[PDB]
Design a protein around this ligand. Structure first.
Ligand SMILES: NC(=O)c1ccccc1Nc1cccc(OCCc2ccccc2)c1
Ligand SMILES: [Zn+2]
Length: 288
């Protein structure tokens, strides 16, 4: 009761000092304020921007981590169209023994299920967002993905699923297009290739009406998202969940999974989320 009054005193004092130009929508710069903000009528659109940190607990590191000219050519598109073998050998070595999304991936599934997710911008090619159930339209796979692959020939472009590529990779035979006999390349954005065009219209408009940015497993100031993030309105709250003046920023520094759990609990979804995760994990265990 005196705490409720103190809560108002702090809110009034922090907004008074902010001053004249900036607008603060969070009633408190905490995970709690963010939960209340996302449970309010103002929060209709949420965009998640995620990186590697949300996959560490699922055991899949970024693959760029540590006769071929320089080490990097294995990541270059033109070197790939001429010498595909090195890449596919590495792809075999690094192929994940499992695809089990994390609590954080499923938290995003809840956002989508509750009609709250405008889009999930990801730097991961690991495919977990799709396994957790996010669809093509909910995503902008910025470094591309190994989920699908295509024939390199412009007048063919035959698509192939992971099933088909996995088999090739472990058999150590170079994937060829059944129709045009041309190479079949994973839809990863190789060095030299570019982010596909339709994603630009997302970037150019999604950030205009976003009500909340959830940045997880990657940092706020690092390019390239930093530039995507800077297109959001200045009043747009941003919650950062990553391992290691302010009026519209809140930070949860710790493991991405524990963070999504604390937020889900504050929203009363903890149980529903832990149920989704147990279920899918068993449902994935029974496929293989
Ligand atoms: N962003 C990247 O990691 C990347 C960028 C350009 C070129 C290659 C890249 N990744 C890469 C390069 C070599 C092998 C590899 O591992 C592939 C295994 C895999 C990928 C995605 C899903 C499941 C398995 C990934
Ligand atoms: Zn083809």
């Amino acid at each position: 009761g005196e705490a409720d009054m103190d809560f108002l005193r702090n809110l009034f004092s922090q907004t008074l000092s902010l001053g004249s130009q900036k607008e603060r929508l969070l009633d408190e710069l905490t995970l709690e304020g963010v939960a209340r903000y996302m449970q309010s009528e103002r929060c209709r659109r949420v965009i998640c921007l995620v990186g590697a940190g949300i996959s560490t607990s699922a055991g899949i590191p970024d693959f760029r981590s540590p006769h071929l000219p320089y080490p990097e050519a294995i990541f270059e598109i033109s070197y790939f169209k001429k010498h595909p073998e090195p890449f596919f050998a590495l792809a075999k070595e690094l192929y994940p023994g499992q695809f089990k999304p994390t609590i954080c991936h499923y938290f995003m599934r809840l956002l989508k299920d509750k009609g709250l997710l405008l889009r999930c911008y990801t730097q991961n090619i690991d495919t977990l967002e799709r396994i957790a159930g996010l669809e093509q339209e909910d995503l902008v796979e910025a470094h591309g993905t190994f989920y699908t692959s295509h024939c390199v020939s412009a007048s063919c472009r035959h698509e192939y699923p992971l099933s088909w590529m996995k088999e090739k990779i472990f058999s150590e035979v170079t994937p060829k297009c059944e129709d045009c006999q041309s190479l079949v390349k994973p839809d990863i954005v190789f060095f030299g290739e570019s982010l596909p065009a339709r994603f630009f219209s997302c970037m150019q408009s999604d950030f205009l009406k976003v009500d909340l940015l959830l940045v997880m497993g990657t940092s706020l100031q690092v390019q390239p998202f930093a530039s995507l993030i800077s297109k959001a309105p200045l009043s747009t709250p941003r919650l950062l969940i990553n391992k290691e003046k302010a009026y519209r920023d809140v930070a949860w520094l710790g493991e991405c999974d524990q963070g999504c759990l604390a937020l889900a609990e504050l929203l009363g979804w903890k149980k529903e989320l832990e149920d989704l995760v147990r279920r899918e994990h068993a449902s994935i265990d029974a496929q293989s």
